[PDB]
């Protein structure tokens, strides 16, 4: 599923991400835009052989199991394929664990390089939330 911008904002807000660990909703929408272009089915292979999955490009080296990332952890205790669902619940719950682990949203390279320090509220402007 490819989300619209306000559709995704509303879904993330209903799943408790607005101001989760101090990150306003616009940060999450911005990250999803540049990580996956709002496409829940996005995958991308990394140099180390791990793969990023879903709307927030969660990495199989640490967070989910794809059966082909040797020596990897599965800290969200989910198959990576669950992160590609049109239901974002699994991706959101896993993201909540990532953002709480110490480094905040700096875990998302695209957020660090394209959202951090910008006017992220623009990403929810005009949305009925
Ligand atoms: Cl915001
Ligand atoms: Cl980047
Ligand atoms: Na959803």
UniProtKB/Swiss-Prot annotation:
Q: Name which cysteines form disulfide bonds.
A: 6-127, 30-115, 64-80, 76-94
Q: What is its EC number?
A: 3.2.1.17
Does Metal-binding show up as a keyword for this record?
A: no
Annotated GO molecular function terms are: beta-N-acetylglucosaminidase activity; identical protein binding; lysozyme activity
UniProt subcellular location: Secreted
Q: Which InterPro entries match?
A: Glyco_hydro_22 (IPR001916), Glyco_hydro_22_CS (IPR019799), Glyco_hydro_22_lys (IPR000974), Lysozyme-like_dom_sf (IPR023346)
Q: Which reaction does it catalyse?
A: Hydrolysis of (1->4)-beta-linkages between N-acetylmuramic acid and N-acetyl-D-glucosamine residues in a peptidoglycan and between N-acetyl-D-glucosamine residues in chitodextrins
Presence of keyword ATP-binding: no
What EC class does the entry list? Answer: hydrolase
Q: What Pfam families is this protein classified in?
A: Lys
Tissue occurrence: In the egg white and polymorphonuclear leukocytes.
Locate the active site: 35, 52
Task: Describe the protein's quaternary organization and the partners it interacts with.
Answer: Monomer.
Q: Give the record's family classification.
A: Belongs to the glycosyl hydrolase 22 family.
Record protein name field: Lysozyme C
The encoding gene: LYZ
